[PDB]
């Protein structure tokens, strides 16, 4: 009665899980909407996303996790639960070995609550490993080998940039200069430029749409629809791909300097690894047109940028089952 293996790659912005024999379950948002004041939960997921800022009074929602941090255990912790929850088996946790990913400000404590939690709910086995190892995996590079793999992951709360070798990381560095970053800025650029009011949603689609790092072979621009700042009156402006990629290259300048922080703490006989072979760069923000273009211009070395960069983290953990399989069977 082979013991059911569950993976979750617990993330700021989307939340992916696993189960062997099912497959991915759930890979939505890491949002909750619930009544104001009940434990009623009334959308969770992509259906929560959309509430972002589109609430009344009766409606409010919660996040797990804040910047790669827990914002409120007991949140992460039914967050969980809701995620198990539309898989549609019954006692889905019994038994089973459960790895969740997560990111390294995840605290020992909130781990081990996590671990817990899991426990209490039937699991036999529950192991924590950092995302950023896991996306390594999931991104096609053999973490276990005795080699130095150099990975960038570009989330929404968190940028982190390592170095990995015979099955663990060797160095990392994790940043608050990534996606909802990017787009806050967008939208405070926005304001400053075209003296009109959007909203996240606005700058985020800006972004995805005609956001770039190097000026590609199609030229894009873009109507969005806001307020005049002044007259608070109804205003639509167009936004071209040319000033976005300016302020896009402007804010990537910390993350290419966490690029070079992490080589020049880079072990020598990793470096010449990570050198040779080259950046592997994974998230959701791996995404952004000309990226490929101008991390390589920078540090001349080849970038390989993640067929899979969204799924990088929970495909990783699928790679990862047997290591956790061998840890239940050894610690009898
Ligand atoms: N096509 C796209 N182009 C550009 N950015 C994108 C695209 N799709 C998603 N994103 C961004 O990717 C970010 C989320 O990446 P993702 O790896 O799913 O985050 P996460 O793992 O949940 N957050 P984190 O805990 O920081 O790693 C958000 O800022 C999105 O706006
Ligand atoms: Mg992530």
Redesign the pocket.
Known sequence: PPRKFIAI?L?????IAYIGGRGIIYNEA?VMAYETGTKKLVALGEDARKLIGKTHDKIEIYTP?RN?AITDLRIAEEFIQHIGNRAKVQDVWKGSIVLIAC?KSVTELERRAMVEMCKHLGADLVQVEE?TLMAALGAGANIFAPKGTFIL?I????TSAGIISAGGIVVSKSIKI???Y??EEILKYIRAKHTISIGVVTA?QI??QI?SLYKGKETKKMVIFGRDVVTGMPKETEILDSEIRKLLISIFSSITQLVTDILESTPAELAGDAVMNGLLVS???A??SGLKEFLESYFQIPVKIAKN??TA?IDGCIAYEKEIRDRLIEEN
């Open positions: 790659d993330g700021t912005t989307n939340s890491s996790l790669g990111p995302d992951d989330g929404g709360g968190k990534a996606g909802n990017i787009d985020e972004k995805k956001g998230g959701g923000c995404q952004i960069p969204q983290v």
